[PDB]
Amino acid sequence: NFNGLKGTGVLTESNKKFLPFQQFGRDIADTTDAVRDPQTLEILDITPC
Amino acid sequence: SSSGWTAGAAAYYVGYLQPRTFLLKYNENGTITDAVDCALDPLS
Numbered sequence: 601n602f603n604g605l606k607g608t609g610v611l612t613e614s615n616k617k618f619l620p621f622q623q624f625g626r627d628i629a630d631t632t633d634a635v636r637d638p639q640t641l642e643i644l645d646i647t648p649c
Numbered sequence: 650s651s652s653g654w655t656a657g658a659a660a661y662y663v664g665y666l667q668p669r670t671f672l673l674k675y676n677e678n679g680t681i682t683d684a685v686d687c688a689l690d691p692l693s
């Protein structure tokens with residue numbers, strides 16, 4: 601439920617780069633594929649089960 | 650003083666925007682590499 605985003609999946613470490621203003625990550629089908637943890641900055645890759 | 654002053658070189662440009670539709674190409678890093686207009690030329 602990252603920052604008010606009710607979703608189910610698997611969270612793993614991601615090496616993708618983020619621009620300083622950029623927070624989320626999106627794909628061709630408007631599905632969130634990356635988030636930044638509000639408490640600690642990190643890169644997480646959401647992958648379905 | 651207020652009357653009498655020498656200033657160095659300086660150049661600037663001012664332009665005006667308008668509502669247009671553009672096509673933007675991203676790269677692997679996530680930085681915009683190219684952009685092309687949609688209402689300028691037939692090829693565009």
Ligand SMILES: *[C@@H]1O[C@H](CO)[C@@H](O)[C@H](O)[C@H]1NC(C)=O
Binds near residue numbers: 639640
């Ligand atoms: C909130 O969490 C951040 C990240 O650990 C920390 O730097 C900050 O001091 C915390 N603030 C409070 C009020 O807990």
Ligand SMILES: *[C@@H]1O[C@H](CO)[C@@H](O)[C@H](O)[C@H]1NC(C)=O
Binds near residue numbers: 650651
């Ligand atoms: C420059 O200095 C003179 C010295 O009296 C003064 O009268 C003058 O007001 C000054 N220049 C400006 C723009 O105030």
